[PDB]
Design an enzyme around this catalytic site. Structure first.
Site, short mmCIF file in Angstrom:
data_model
loop_
_atom_site.label_atom_id
_atom_site.label_comp_id
_atom_site.label_asym_id
_atom_site.label_seq_id
_atom_site.Cartn_x
_atom_site.Cartn_y
_atom_site.Cartn_z
N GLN A 1 0.83 -1.20 0.00
CA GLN A 1 0.00 0.00 0.00
C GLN A 1 0.86 1.25 0.00
O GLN A 1 0.56 2.22 -0.71
CB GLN A 1 -0.91 -0.02 1.23
CG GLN A 1 -1.76 1.23 1.47
CD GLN A 1 -2.74 1.50 0.37
OE1 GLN A 1 -2.55 2.39 -0.44
NE2 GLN A 1 -3.83 0.74 0.36
N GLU B 1 -3.55 -6.90 -1.71
CA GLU B 1 -4.87 -6.29 -1.85
C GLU B 1 -5.01 -5.62 -3.21
O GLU B 1 -4.15 -4.83 -3.59
CB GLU B 1 -5.10 -5.28 -0.73
CG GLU B 1 -4.09 -4.12 -0.67
CD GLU B 1 -3.98 -3.49 0.72
OE1 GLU B 1 -2.84 -3.32 1.22
OE2 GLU B 1 -5.03 -3.17 1.31
N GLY C 1 2.38 -6.05 6.34
CA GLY C 1 2.74 -7.42 6.04
C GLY C 1 3.27 -7.61 4.63
O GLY C 1 4.25 -8.32 4.42
N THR C 2 2.63 -6.95 3.66
CA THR C 2 3.08 -7.07 2.28
C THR C 2 4.39 -6.33 2.07
O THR C 2 5.33 -6.86 1.45
CB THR C 2 2.01 -6.54 1.32
OG1 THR C 2 0.72 -6.99 1.75
CG2 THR C 2 2.26 -7.05 -0.08
N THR D 1 0.31 4.10 13.39
CA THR D 1 -1.01 3.69 12.92
C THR D 1 -1.39 2.26 13.26
O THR D 1 -2.58 1.98 13.39
CB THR D 1 -1.12 3.86 11.40
OG1 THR D 1 -0.23 2.95 10.76
CG2 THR D 1 -0.75 5.28 11.00
N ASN E 1 7.58 8.83 9.37
CA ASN E 1 6.44 9.65 9.02
C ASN E 1 6.33 10.88 9.89
O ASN E 1 5.93 11.94 9.40
CB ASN E 1 5.14 8.84 9.11
CG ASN E 1 5.06 7.76 8.06
OD1 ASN E 1 5.93 7.66 7.19
ND2 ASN E 1 4.01 6.95 8.12
N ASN F 1 4.51 11.63 -0.15
CA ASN F 1 5.01 10.88 -1.30
C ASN F 1 5.60 11.80 -2.37
O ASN F 1 6.48 11.37 -3.12
CB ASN F 1 3.90 10.03 -1.89
CG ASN F 1 3.35 9.04 -0.89
OD1 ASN F 1 3.86 8.92 0.22
ND2 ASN F 1 2.30 8.33 -1.28
N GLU G 1 28.78 4.33 -6.97
CA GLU G 1 29.62 5.26 -6.22
C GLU G 1 29.19 5.33 -4.76
O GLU G 1 30.03 5.31 -3.85
CB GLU G 1 29.55 6.64 -6.86
CG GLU G 1 30.05 6.71 -8.28
CD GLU G 1 31.53 6.96 -8.37
OE1 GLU G 1 32.16 7.13 -7.32
OE2 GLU G 1 32.05 7.02 -9.50
N1 GTP Z 1 4.92 7.70 3.28
C1 GTP Z 1 3.84 6.93 3.16
N2 GTP Z 1 3.65 5.86 4.01
C2 GTP Z 1 2.55 5.08 3.89
C3 GTP Z 1 1.62 5.34 2.90
N3 GTP Z 1 0.64 4.42 2.99
C4 GTP Z 1 0.93 3.58 4.00
N4 GTP Z 1 2.10 3.99 4.58
C5 GTP Z 1 2.78 3.32 5.70
O1 GTP Z 1 2.55 1.93 5.60
C6 GTP Z 1 2.49 1.34 6.88
C7 GTP Z 1 1.55 0.14 6.84
O2 GTP Z 1 1.70 -0.59 5.65
P1 GTP Z 1 0.75 -0.33 4.37
O3 GTP Z 1 1.59 0.07 3.19
O4 GTP Z 1 -0.29 0.71 4.69
O5 GTP Z 1 0.05 -1.74 4.07
P2 GTP Z 1 0.95 -2.92 3.46
O6 GTP Z 1 2.41 -2.60 3.64
O7 GTP Z 1 0.63 -3.10 2.01
O8 GTP Z 1 0.50 -4.23 4.27
P3 GTP Z 1 -1.01 -4.76 4.24
O9 GTP Z 1 -1.93 -3.84 5.01
O10 GTP Z 1 -1.04 -6.13 4.87
O11 GTP Z 1 -1.45 -4.86 2.81
C8 GTP Z 1 2.00 2.44 7.80
O12 GTP Z 1 2.79 2.46 8.96
C9 GTP Z 1 2.19 3.73 7.03
O13 GTP Z 1 3.10 4.56 7.71
C10 GTP Z 1 1.82 6.41 2.04
O14 GTP Z 1 0.99 6.65 1.17
N5 GTP Z 1 2.93 7.21 2.17
MG MG Z 2 -1.33 -3.10 2.87
#
Ligand code: GTP
Ligand code: MG
Ligand code: GDP
Ligand code: GDP
Lengths: 409, 50, 410, 50, 426
Positions: free
Chosen positions: A10, A43, A116-117, A151, A178, A200, A226
């Protein structure tokens, strides 16, 4: 010369959704990117937002990989149960992306270790990439969880279990929090109510500033190989604080007189680091300064002199020449709807120090407290893990703490 | 309160923020002046010799 | 007749040489004296570009005077060094140096009587220093009886580009002390200071520094290309400046150098050239010569000048500063006069001084080298490529005994 | 939190305090000695000339 | 042949010298761009005393500008004949003394005079046989007094067997610009008594009264005062640049005019000086020149010699004149006013003639009289200095910068013995 980018999770592909927007807006120089990408997630909701978005036709349909169901903030689920069916399809594509290529500099991976992903199949993808290529660089720009802003709940379990593989798989690892970025947008960008989109956008600025040396001709170019030498003094110490300057709004930029001397300073204050840590507690092992745009070698040369002669910050006793400079001619581009004003010149600094040794120590207690009472452990164990890898990942971070303390002396 | 007091006395003891660079740059410039002076004195002596 | 072939290695070497071929081509062009002595640098220039990053070669063909090189002489790799001397000397060199030796042999046998080879490179980078170093070694075992020139820039702690500069500088000088006939030590700190003080520039980009180094290189080979009242080729200067076979690291200065605001307020006479030539603030190395003694000195003059003025002025500068010269050598100064000045001037001069203050830099680098090598920082990027531990010990030993023989003779 | 903030500032203030430069003061001392030596060396040579 | 380098210190020194190089260049026929356009060979044969041919008819002045503020230096290159100086000769600080003699002599001097000396050393070795050095400065300012003072001391230690002139304006109670004028004057003179070869006492009162009554000007800006001073300085050195019936170099005048080694402060005058209403009604004869020369009001110092006696006096005449008139005029002006001249020296007036007048005039003169009336000025400032020092007013910028109490006591003592030895020798 080309370099391909992988995006997991995500957080990964939302960072990529902003990063690729900047690449298309910026552009033979294109050859290193034009895309040579892969989005992948468990997802389908965020990937299929791209499939119907404005960049429908831009991405080849196969590129956007998407599983059937999410790992759900579960490192074991995204590393042992569900990863095992999608990772093979992903890397058996990335191979033919590399065969399309001829002069591959490396791969660069985007993931957040809290989920997790991003964490689980991140490490799984990394392990098969390391055994398949070995020599080719894989830059991992990861997002670690903040100390106080958070979060999720089980993210300490994920962050430790992910780090154990991020040590010996990635070559150059850049931390990004963050809270630190939230503070940057609050302090410099004066945005009091920021969302993930703004974060982002400026993450993409950092990525673009370190690949612009390959894309465009500068006074002193610097490749990905480098950074491999000039910033990692030991094979297992590669964790980099990041910073950028000038992060500045549209009105303030015109009022202020941006130059090389003060932005070299501004890129060194802890009020502008991308990771929530205070490098005053630590000692700089090495610094790397990417200069973009209107830069002559004299004032960058003069600026590193003033830093060395200051005493507010200190270096290790080992490096008198503790810097690596780099100058590129083309100025940074802007995105309509973005908040950063156009600047003649910008600086992206990537350093290495012992301040990072604090974040791991801070991380240890939170993981330690939960693990002692065996909280949430039953989720991961039923997924396929055991108590063995929890305790052994714990002692791996303990070794890393002693390692930083030993090298810092 | 005790830490605040120690902060104020240490702040007064540093003699200012810009103090360290001025003393450092002054002694460096002093090095250069003696070097310049030594050269002129050598020249006179060697001229006397010839 | 007498021939000098050119080799340019690395980004530093390529951009310096591009400016070098601009000034030589402009020098050889009304006068028929220009046509009689172009075999030394032409057949197209007798040059070979050599690098590992295509940006430098493309940058060479883009700029003016970039379409005059023969594309076959663009011998060139593709993967890149990355400021790794081990990569520049063991891995990437092993497949590009064979190709450079093909083209260098073709450019050497094309002419009748070689005078020597002329290499321009750096000592901090990897593909410049290391590959050019290996190139020099391959050339020395094939052509031992020919001259050799290496204009090498040395890094300073004040101009500190990369982090592994000492690891590369120490290893590079370990090969220069046996391979090259003589070298002209350069650096960026002195160059930047010269453009501040004498030239008084506000924005000294690399174009200006490379223009200054180019003027020196053109000046040292003027005696071959033009008739003079007293000729001194490369071999003549070498024997007059080098008392012992390993003591062949020189410091260079060029004159006249004045800001564009004061160009018309000044005089141009031999006493006026000599005051600026012997000025310690005018060396193009960060080694203050008044911190030691001069073993020997040489001044190459260009322009219609009275030879009596030359000899009496050099005698004066030796009588006045009588403590700064070696004792067991009287009349430490070699001189030469050529009748053709560089374009845009009337009377020019080039100083080459073999002093014993140069041992400060070699000692000045060793403490940085010993600082890193004591606790093995950055060592695996060199070790895991093919180098072992005894190479750094050998390199350190040669640095130490080198500064000792300067200290001995001082 | 405020105690930690104050403590860092004290440590910064203590770092900044000017410290004696041993490697440079001795240089100055040695330079003056050579200077004084040359003065006495000069007077004997002037005597010789008369 | 014999060469004189020029050194200008402080604001007063810089502006005085700017008009000096303009007037001199006009005498030798060099246009503001620095090229030769004269006609007579007599102008080209003696420009080596003050200039150096650079390249292609480029003659640059042999001068060194030195001060502590950028405003003066910029004001030099702005005006005409501002483009003739070599830019390397602009030795130049940035911070400033602030009319603090200690800052000009101990604080800021330590970092500039070394640089000044490099340029001065280069200008001395650039010429073959030095005749001397020429320094224009003030005595009430800080950067002119202190900076120029330490420079004079160091120079006399380097080149001791060479002449040296110091053209110095001194402060007076009626024209009082700075408040610490006495502190600066007495310490500056304390250095001049043991360093300078001979000094020329100037002051602003006399300049104001010359432009009031003689010149009859309505708006006498500083350009006219500097114009007057430049004519006197050109007169003292005309003998080196032009041949004549009776030449008199700098050494010839000093050895002839200075009977005792510490008594080397002079009073100056210049002739002719006439207003535009009377420039037509006058004649040009040697006696007409002499009376306007020896006039009390025409002295370029506000110290009336008729309050005392003349020790020695000198006259430098310029133009085609008959030497008999020169000698008989000096004899007559000494015989009628016999009491005003010292007794144990007969023929107290040395005279010389040069055959080239200033451009635009048929015949001129320049008077250099070493009288005994100058002690008035030393007392006039000494009592003001003692009045201030006996309560330590304005002392903390002096004692806090490096002076002690004994330095001011040394200054008074040297002040008091000089006025006492003037009183004896009169
Ligand atoms: N900088 C930034 N961090 C993000 C963003 N979206 C999610 N995160 C970070 O991602 C962490 C959680 O993982 P996610 O990417 O939301 O979800 P995932 O890694 O795909 O894992 P799953 O929920 O199991 O699918 C959170 O602690 C957020 O800080 C984003 O758009 N920008
Ligand atoms: Mg996710
Ligand atoms: N004078 C000059 N020096 C240069 C130039 N380009 C690079 N350098 C110097 O070269 C050093 C880096 O060399 P590098 O590019 O790593 O050489 P390479 O990688 O082997 O080709 C730096 O210390 C620079 O100061 C140039 O155009 N002119
Ligand atoms: N003749 C003349 N005297 C001046 C001029 N400007 C200032 N002065 C005198 O200088 C004195 C003050 O000295 P100052 O200019 O401050 O000297 P400085 O600061 O050392 O350069 C006053 O008594 C003025 O009479 C000028 O343009 N011409």
């Amino acid at each position: 010369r080309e370099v391909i980018s992988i995006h997991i999770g995500q957080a990964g592909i939302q960072v990529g959704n902003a990063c690729w927007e900047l690449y298309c807006l910026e552009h033979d120089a294109f050859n290193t990117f034009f895309p040579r990408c892969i989005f992948l997630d468990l997802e389908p909701t965020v990937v299929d937002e791209v499939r119907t978005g404005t960049y429908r036709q831009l991405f080849h349909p196969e590129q956007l990989i998407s599983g059937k169901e999410d790992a759900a903030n579960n490192f074991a689920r995204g590393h042992y149960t569900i990863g095992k069916e999608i990772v093979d399809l992903a890397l058996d594509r990335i191979r033919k992306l590399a065969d399309n290529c001829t002069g591959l500099q490396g791969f660069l991976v985007f993931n957040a270790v809290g989920g997790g992903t991003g964490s689980g199949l991140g490490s799984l993808l990394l392990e098969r990439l390391s055994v398949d290529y070995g020599k080719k660089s894989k830059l991992g720009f990861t997002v670690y969880p903040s100390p106080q802003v958070s979060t999720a709940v089980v993210e300490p379990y994920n962050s430790v279990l992910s780090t154990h593989s991020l040590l010996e798989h990635t070559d150059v690892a850049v931390m990004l929090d963050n809270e630190a970025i939230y503070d940057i947008c609050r302090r410099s960008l004066d945005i009091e109510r920021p969302t993930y989109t703004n974060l982002n956008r400026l993450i993409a600025q950092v990525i673009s500033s370190l690949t612009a040396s390959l894309r465009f001709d500068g006074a002193l170019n610097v490749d990905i190989t480098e950074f491999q030498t000039n910033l990692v003094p030991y094979p297992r110490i590669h964790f980099m604080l990041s910073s950028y300057a000038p992060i500045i709004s549209a009105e303030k930029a015109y009022h202020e007189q941006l130059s090389v001397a003060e932005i070299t300073n501004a890129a060194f204050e802890p009020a502008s680091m991308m990771v929530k840590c205070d490098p005053r507690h630590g000692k700089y092992m090495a610094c790397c300064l990417m200069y973009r745009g209107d830069v002559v070698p004299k004032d960058v040369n003069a600026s590193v002199a003033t830093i060395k002669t200051k005493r507010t910050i200190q270096f290790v006793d080992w490096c008198p020449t503790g810097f690596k400079c780099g100058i590129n001619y083309q100025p940074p581009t802007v995105v309509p709807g973005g908040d950063l004003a156009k600047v003649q010149r910008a600086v992206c600094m990537i350093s290495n120090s012992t301040a990072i040794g604090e974040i791991f120590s801070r991380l240890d207690h939170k993981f330690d407290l939960m693990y002692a009472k065996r909280a949430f452990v039953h989720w991961y164990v039923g997924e396929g893990m055991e108590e063995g890898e929890f305790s052994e990942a714990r002692e791996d971070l303990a070794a890393l703490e002693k390692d930083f303390e030993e090298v810092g002396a | 309160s005790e830490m605040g007091s120690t902060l104020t006395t240490t702040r007064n003891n540093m003699g200012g923020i810009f103090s360290a660079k001025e003393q450092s740059t002054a002694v460096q410039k002093r090095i250069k002046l003696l070097e310049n002076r030594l050269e002129k004195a050598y020249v006179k002596y060697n001229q006397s010799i010839t | 007749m007498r021939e000098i072939v050119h080799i340019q290695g690395g980004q530093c070497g390529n951009q310096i040489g591009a400016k070098f071929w601009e000034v030589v081509s402009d020098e050889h062009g009304d006068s028929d004296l220009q046509l009689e002595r172009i075999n030394v640098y032409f057949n197209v220039p007798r040059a070979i570009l050599m690098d590992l990053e295509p940006g430098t070669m493309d940058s060479v063909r883009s700029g003016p005077y970039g379409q005059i090189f023969r594309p076959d002489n663009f011998v060139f790799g593709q993967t890149g060094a990355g400021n790794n001397w081990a990569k520049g000397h063991y891995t990437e060199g092993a497949e590009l140096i064979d190709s450079v030796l093909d083209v260098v042999r073709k450019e050497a046998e094309s002419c009748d009587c070689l005078q020597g080879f002329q290499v321009c490179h750096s000592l901090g980078g990897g593909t410049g220093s290391g590959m050019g170093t290996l190139l020099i070694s391959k050339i020395r075992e094939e052509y031992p009886d020919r001259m050799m020139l290496t204009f090498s820039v040395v890094p300073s702690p004040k101009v500190s580009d990369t982090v592994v500069e000492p690891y590369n500088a120490t290893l590079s000088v370990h090969q220069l002390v046996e391979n090259a006939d003589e070298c002209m030590v350069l650096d960026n700190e002195a160059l930047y200071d010269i453009c501040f003080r004498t030239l008084k520039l506000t924005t000294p980009t690399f174009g200006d520094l490379n223009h200054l180094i180019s003027a020196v290189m053109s000046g040292i080979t003027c005696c071959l290309r033009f008739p003079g009242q007293l000729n001194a080729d490369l071999r003549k200067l070498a024997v007059n400046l080098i008392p012992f076979p390993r003591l062949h690291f020189f410091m260079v200065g060029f004159t006249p150098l004045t800001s564009r605001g004061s160009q018309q307020y000044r005089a141009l006479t031999v006493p006026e050239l000599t005051q600026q030539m012997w000025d310690a603030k005018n060396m193009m190395c960060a080694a203050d010569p008044r911190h030691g003694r001069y073993l020997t000195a040489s001044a190459l003059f260009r322009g219609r000048m009275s030879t009596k003025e030359v000899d009496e002025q050099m005698l004066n500068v030796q009588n006045k500063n009588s403590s700064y010269f070696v004792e067991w050598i009287p009349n430490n100064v070699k001189s030469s006069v050529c009748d053709i000045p560089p374009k845009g001037l009337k009377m020019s001069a080039t100083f080459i001084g073999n002093s014993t203050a140069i041992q400060e830099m070699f000692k000045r680098v060793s403490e940085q080298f010993t600082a890193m090598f004591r606790r093995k920082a950055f060592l695996h990027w060199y070790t895991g490529e093919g180098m072992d531990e005894m190479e750094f010990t050998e390199a350190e030993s040669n640095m130490n005994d080198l500064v000792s023989e300067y200290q001995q003779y001082q | 939190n405020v105690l930690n903030k104050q403590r860092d500032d004290t440590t910064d203030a203590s770092r900044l305090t000017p410290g004696e430069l041993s490697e440079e003061q001795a240089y100055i001392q040695q330079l003056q000695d050579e200077m004084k030596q040359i003065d006495e060396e000069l007077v004997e040579a002037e005597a010789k000339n008369r």
